[PDB]
């Protein structure tokens, strides 16, 4: 044939595109504050820029709930008892929080990222039946978890909401938030056990706490970032009697993968997943390997189109140290930044799929390619190639455009610009070898 031809059915739609992102929570943020200001930049330009970087849509900020900055812990805005639910909680802002708030503050106001999710991975120590941010406990006066120092549920509301309140008068708007993280998993660091039943007690707790509030913007509420899409599905039945208190659902991608879609009416987003004990590779294919760029494109593109998500984070951006918890080193010796081509991987994705964008329909791929298509809010058309085969002549069309552009990521390439040839509405690419190409088509 004529090379594949591609033909995208704006009229058959599915979920709506929120973003890609990825978190610098448990003083990640710090890492990257000590570089030096020109490794500052490179480090932020690889993670937010829309023209020399990943273009990432969604930063995830951890509400941090230790009582210092020991280790890696994120403090607490609240890191000192009040002695009793009963008494004001002691606010202790520290105009930083663990170094998220510069993140965010460039996230928004030098590249436009406008989605912040903020989630808790515990309570303070003291609102829980352990007295103890980390080794999991509960929440006091939850059922089941009555506690000798009273009900800290409408003061874990009235934390959660303050929290919000610091980033609006750092000029941030938190637009979704979490109190919970791993429910189901009792770790040695910030931890905390909520069962189904008990999340949908404190969504009724929280909720009106956040719409009675003073915020110029009210956060969508999230649940429940457990480790696993299996584990997360467990969790919608109970959480179904407050589906009008809560607008999102988040899991990530540990303990089973994002392969089928979830029953409920709320966006689900993959909200944390990488190759966490993996020897560090920057490289796009070896031999398709848990760490390989190539590998995580087709997680990317799994999570959507198997898993239904709506979006999808890597769990750190830029850090230091030797495995693939992150997608960018950071060399603390050196004052350097590297992207791994995990970092192109998904901005291969985030670059040309911008928030609000309707995945659709596009028939025509075979063999060596998978494909999918994006709608964006400004009526350009993404589409994704992943080719598993070797150079792929491919024509993309609409079942009009005015013009055309095409970008690859592989071996060589990081989201470089290739030659998109234009004729009529049509765009012709040549989409390289064991590649991930992009294909926009955009309306004059
Ligand atoms: C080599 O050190 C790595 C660790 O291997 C890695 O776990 C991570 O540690 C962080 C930590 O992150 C976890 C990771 O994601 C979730 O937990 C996983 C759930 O599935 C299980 O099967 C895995 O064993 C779990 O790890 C969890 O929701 C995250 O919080 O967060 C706390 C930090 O204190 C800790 O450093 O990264 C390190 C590293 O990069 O050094
Ligand atoms: C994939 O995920 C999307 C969400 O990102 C799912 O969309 C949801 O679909 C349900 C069932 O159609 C929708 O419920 C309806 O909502 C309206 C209000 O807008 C309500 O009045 C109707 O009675 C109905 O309950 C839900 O709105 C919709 N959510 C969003 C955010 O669009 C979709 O179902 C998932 N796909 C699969 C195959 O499961």
């Known amino acids: 044939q004529a090379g594949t031809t591609l033909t995208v059915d704006l009229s058959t739609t599915y979920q709506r595109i929120d973003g890609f992102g990825t978190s610098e929570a448990f003083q990640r943020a710090v890492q990257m504050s000590r570089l030096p200001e020109e490794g500052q930049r490179r480090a932020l330009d690889v993670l937010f820029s829309t023209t020399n970087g990943a273009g990432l849509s969604i930063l995830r900020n951890g509400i941090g709930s230790s009582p210092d900055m020991s280790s890696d812990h994120m403090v607490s805005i609240a890191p000192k008892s009040p002695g009793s639910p009963n008494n004001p909680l002691i606010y202790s802002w520290d105009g930083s929080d663990n170094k998220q708030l510069w993140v965010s503050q460039e996230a928004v106001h030098t590249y436009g990222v406008k989605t912040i999710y903020a989630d808790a991975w515990s309570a303070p120590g003291y609102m829980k039946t352990n007295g103890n941010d980390a080794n999991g406990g509960t929440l006091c006066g939850l059922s089941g978890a009555q506690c000798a120092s009273g009900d800290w549920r409408q003061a874990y509301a009235d934390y959660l909401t303050k929290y919000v309140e610091f980033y609006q008068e750092s000029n941030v708007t938190v637009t979704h938030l979490g109190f919970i993280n791993a429910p189901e998993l009792t ?58 208190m809560f607008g999102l659902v988040t899991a990530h991608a540990y303990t089973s993968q994002p392969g089928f879609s979830m029953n409920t009416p709320h966006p689900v987003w993959m909200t944390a997943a990488a190759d966490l004990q993996g020897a560090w590779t920057s490289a796009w294919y070896s031999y398709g390997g848990a760490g390989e760029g190539w590998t995580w494109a087709n997680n990317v593109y799994n999570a959507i189109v198997n898993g239904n998500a709506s979006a999808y984070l890597y769990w750190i951006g830029a850090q230091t140290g030797n495995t693939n918890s992150h997608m960018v080193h950071i060399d603390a010796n050196a004052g350097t930044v590297e992207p791994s081509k995990r970092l192109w991987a998904l901005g291969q994705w985030s670059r040309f799929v911008r928030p609000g964008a309707r995945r659709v329909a596009v028939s025509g791929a075979s063999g060596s390619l998978r494909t999918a298509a994006f709608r964006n809010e400004d009526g350009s058309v993404a ?42 509405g049509v765009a012709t690419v040549n989409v390289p070898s064991r590649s991930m190409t992009t294909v926009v088509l955009y309306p004059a």
């Open 187 to 244: 770790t040695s660091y910030a931890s905390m056990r909520f069962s189904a039943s008990q999340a949908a007690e404190f969504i009724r707790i929280l909720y009106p706490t956040i719409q009675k509030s003073n915020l110029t913007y009210k956060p969508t509420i999230a649940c429940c970032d457990a480790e696993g899409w299996n584990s997360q599905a467990g969790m919608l039945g109970a959480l179904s009697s407050v589906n009008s």
């Open 383 to 424: 589409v994704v190639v992943i080719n598993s085969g070797g150079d792929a002549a491919v024509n993309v069309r609409l079942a009009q455009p005015a013009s055309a552009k095409a970008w690859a990521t592989d071996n060589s390439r990081a989201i470089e610009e290739i030659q998109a040839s234009f004729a009529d």
